[PDB]
Amino acid sequence: ANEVAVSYSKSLKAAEMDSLQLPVDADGYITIFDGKTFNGWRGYGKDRVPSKWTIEDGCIKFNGSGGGEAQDGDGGDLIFAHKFKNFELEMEWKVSKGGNSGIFYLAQEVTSKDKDGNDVLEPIYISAPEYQVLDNDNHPDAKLGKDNNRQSASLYDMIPAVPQNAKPFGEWNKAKIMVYKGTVVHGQNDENVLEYHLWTKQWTDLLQASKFSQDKWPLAFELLNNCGGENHEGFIGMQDHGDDVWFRNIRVKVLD
Amino acid sequence: ANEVAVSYSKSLKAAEMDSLQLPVDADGYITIFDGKTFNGWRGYGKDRVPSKWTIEDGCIKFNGSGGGEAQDGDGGDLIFAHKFKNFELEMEWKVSKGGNSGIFYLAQEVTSKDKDGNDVLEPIYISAPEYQVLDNDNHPDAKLGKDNNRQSASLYDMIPAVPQNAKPFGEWNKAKIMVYKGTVVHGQNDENVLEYHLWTKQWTDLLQASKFSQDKWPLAFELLNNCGGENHEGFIGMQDHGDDVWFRNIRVKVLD
Ligand SMILES: [K+]
Ligand SMILES: [K+]
Ligand SMILES: [K+]
Ligand SMILES: [K+]
């Protein structure tokens, strides 16, 4: 009753052939970060946690060197290597001034083939919807997109958080991501800030008005349009966008 | 809080060992061209302003002889000799009928060695992304390239400005170049006309499709693929492409 087995994979596209015994509370939230280890976590596309991700004061910290999407040094996005389907995630996040990160969900590890048959690891964000994490006051992306749909807790580049009730940089915010049989809800600071439905005509329309449109990014469109792949499942994770960011109290309830 | 110290270099590859006190407005834009002097400005590769650059009715003016890329006489590209990293440049430009120039950013002063060990000054454009400045209606380069990627406000011969909202020749156009932690946005006439991300696989892909591909121009590939060199910073400047062009209201906000 106090712990549950949680399967996890150890490397790119591998089976979940190991399990962790993780604490669960009376309401079914599984604590997936223990404050001390990266057990069950690995870099997206990797068999290890990049050293730029550290543990400090009971938090997961990304130690950013400032290159945005570049993911220079020993970086890359971080996943908890258990595919979830119907789930409610809660975590606290805090961004540095002018900082950018994100919470990914239903992510798939995706490769493509180059002209010579070599693999190319594709970005997590071309399969995974992103709950934006941002300093809404200082990061210029805050003013891009449309109707503030690149500010914190937005579905990045598609649906704005309303209300935009973020606390300013260097202050803790609470995130909720709920996916239940295609219904998706983002929460910020104990309010619901958007709601949408995967795999619908509305979902296709959102994609087509975004940077992941069929015309702008065909592979992104195809992955996202059938988000979670054949079995409508995938990873939670957090973004290396080159900036200091902290995450804590990371818990997930299986709704399935 | 009316003025800020801005360091600048006096000659090829030198340290920024001197500073100007330059006005800053309440939004944090530094006025880097004072309407009267070339303080802090020098030719690319030079320790002086080339005499073909003049100050005319509160503008920086290039006085073109009509020889395109030749840079004949006392010409050459012009830089403001302060390396910027995370910044937003705004400036206004106007061209002569059929005129062509460009706004460079993140530029490095690069030399190579010839077969005998002498120096060769390499063009600014093998290190510096170029925001195209053009008479889109009369200069034939507007019809060259792919999908209008050589028209004004494009990332020259790589990403077209969309929309193409230039004002015609003899009229002032407003340019915006923002570089923030690798995110690049070009604006033209108060619209954002393209976005990209430096130092990503998408950036590499753009280069490999261009005249600066690894196959076609290895040195340019090396420089642009790691644009800004090891500290990801470099100069703003403007192009000698042999044609009369005017620039004014040149202002830069340091973002980080
Ligand atoms: K681990
Ligand atoms: K983000
Ligand atoms: K000077
Ligand atoms: K040009």
Curated annotation (Swiss-Prot), chains A, B:
Major location category of this protein: membrane
Location in the cell: Cell membrane
Molecular function GO labels: hydrolase activity, acting on glycosyl bonds
Key words, A-Z: Carbohydrate metabolism, Cell membrane, Glycosidase, Hydrolase, Lipoprotein, Membrane, Palmitate, Signal
Gene3D superfamilies: Exo-inulinase, domain 1
Membrane-spanning intervals of the chain: none
The keyword Kinase is annotated on this UniProt entry: no
Observed phenotype of the null mutant: Deletion mutant lacks the ability to convert glucosinolates to isothiocyanates. Monocolonization of mice with the mutant shows reduced isothiocyanate production in the gastrointestinal tract.
Record-level GO cellular component terms: plasma membrane
Protein name, as recorded: 3-keto-disaccharide hydrolase
